Amino acid sequence: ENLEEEGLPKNPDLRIAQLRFLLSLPEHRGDAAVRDELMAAVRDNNMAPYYEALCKSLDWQIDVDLLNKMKKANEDELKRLDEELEDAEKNLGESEIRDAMMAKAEYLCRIGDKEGALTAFRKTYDKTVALGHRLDIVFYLLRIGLFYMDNDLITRNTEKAKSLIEEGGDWDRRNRLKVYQGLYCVAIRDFKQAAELFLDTVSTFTSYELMDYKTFVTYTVYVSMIALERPDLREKVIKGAEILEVLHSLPAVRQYLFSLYECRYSVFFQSLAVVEQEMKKDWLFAPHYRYYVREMRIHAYSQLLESYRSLTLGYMAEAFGVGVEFIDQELSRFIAAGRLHCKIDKVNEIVETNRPDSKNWQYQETIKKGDLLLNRVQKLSRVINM
Amino acid sequence: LRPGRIDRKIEFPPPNEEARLDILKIHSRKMNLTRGINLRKIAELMPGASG
Amino acid sequence: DDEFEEFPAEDWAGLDEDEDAHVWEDNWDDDNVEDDFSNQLRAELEKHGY
Amino acid sequence: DVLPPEADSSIMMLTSDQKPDVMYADIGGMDIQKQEVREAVELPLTHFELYKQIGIDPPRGVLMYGPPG
Amino acid sequence: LDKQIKEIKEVIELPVKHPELFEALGIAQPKGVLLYGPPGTGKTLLARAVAHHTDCTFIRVSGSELVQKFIGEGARMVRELFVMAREHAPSIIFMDEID
Ligand SMILES: Nc1ncnc2c1ncn2[C@@H]1O[C@H](COP(=O)(O)OP(=O)(O)O)[C@@H](O)[C@H]1O
Ligand SMILES: [Mg+2]
16 A cells, blocks of 8 residues: 555656656647646646746747746745755754755655756765765656666666666665666667666565556566567566566556467457557657557567478458458568568469578678667768878 | 762663564564554564663 | 858758657668558458448 | 685685585474574675665574574 | 653753853763663664754774774773774764673
């Protein structure tokens, strides 16, 4: 019952970023329900700097009375914290001075003053003696980084957090960082790392400030189906007791997960379309909703063709509940992309599977990934000379 | 014990139910804990124990 | 430095609001113009009379 | 010159012939002592990664004390 | 030990960080603290924590003859450690009674 109380402070509220993202979408720009919830969070926390940015990017009408009322609260609260900081630095002790800035940094983060919060947190970090208190400040910066998707902030603070967890063996903080790392891995299309980090914390999840547990398991299932092999999926996801318990309350996610494993391809495609729309409205998965569904379709096509030497176009169409032409266009597109190891005999409508060696696939990446390395070396020498 | 020798005497009573929970929370952070551990019950199960 | 003012610098007129600001292994397949898979599947479920 | 680390040691390790013939079964009625020694000496040697995953700091040393015999 | 942290702060932190508070108050700065309680209650934990937070050197005086070579070759009286304490001022000299 005390699950949400265990999580880290909800500063910045990642729901606000999700609410802001929905308004960025043309479909949900005019949704009053989302607008009311975002405005309710803004009004409650007196997020004056966020109000200016919200109205500037979205081209809204600034309520002068509301903004002035909130700005006065921000000035009064900042003055109160400054007086507390002045009081602590002259009479009280260093721990009380540290708490004074932490409140000031927390308030600036709460009201959306990202630039002020980063400076204030850096000042607080400089004279914070306790190691865990330092690590919480890093987790604050990580949450700020995720709020604005500041890749430099997330990557820099992730390295700092990893170092802090090494010095003090805080396994509790280590589990939280994996959730933070996995969320960033989702945001940067690193589903292979996201699945590994999410599955390690599926039984140690306490990061309620980022997401609810059902949503975490929902994402954990999603990234697992695209990044795990069939044997790994069965041991970790299908037979995972922690995930299976949560899936009892999420019939759609369980239907999506088990349809591919149980080879119910017509069911899976219907569930994949549902996952698409959920992923389109998610601020984390939105840039990769096209990629994930395309990859998931490749997985389903490959899985059906993996165990059979040849399958007719009609059988593939019947299994997926689609037409023959749709399978033709999809298979041809993916085979040409080099993702499906099969070839189509359109005259007889037969798809014949191939077995290309891993050596060919390893050779191309060395050519590909090596070439990316060479340009950096080539370009770095260019910077060196002049 | 003569006044003026020791300027302040600070007592450290054995942790009560709430203080034991705080100590339990501090040291359990160094372990791989499954979610949902009811440390409050564990604190109740240790009457008259030290840190 | 000898900047290339000779070549007509076409006006930027770009979106300085962090249009992409991402670092992935991005490929051309994400940029193919097509409706969402939900629309594609929904446009085929009734094509079979279902 | 820098001599190999295993070199320059007046104390040698136990060879195969110097291994004592006393088995665990030869010892009777020290299950608590065997478990504590096993959990602190021979299990950390083979299961160091399991200790780190759980969060236990393996004990560097073990002091065995008691009445003689 | 929130109450204990506050009590030891006004006695070990305030005299070091703000000696002017006691001069204005007209009282001598505290110099001796006694932490008493059952074993394992955190007396050494708090005393070490204060020395770590006020940047005061923490010296544990157990009376061990193993550390006597570091204190001094004389070793006749325990006040010989004050030479090392003055060099590392502010310093907290801690003794724990095993009893
Ligand atoms: N109130 C407490 N909170 C957290 N840890 C404690 C507390 N009391 C004792 N401990 C733990 O007990 C260990 C030893 O306690 P110690 O302070 O040496 O006992 P004593 O106060 O009798 O000297 C420390 O490593 C510390 O982590
Ligand atoms: Mg003790």
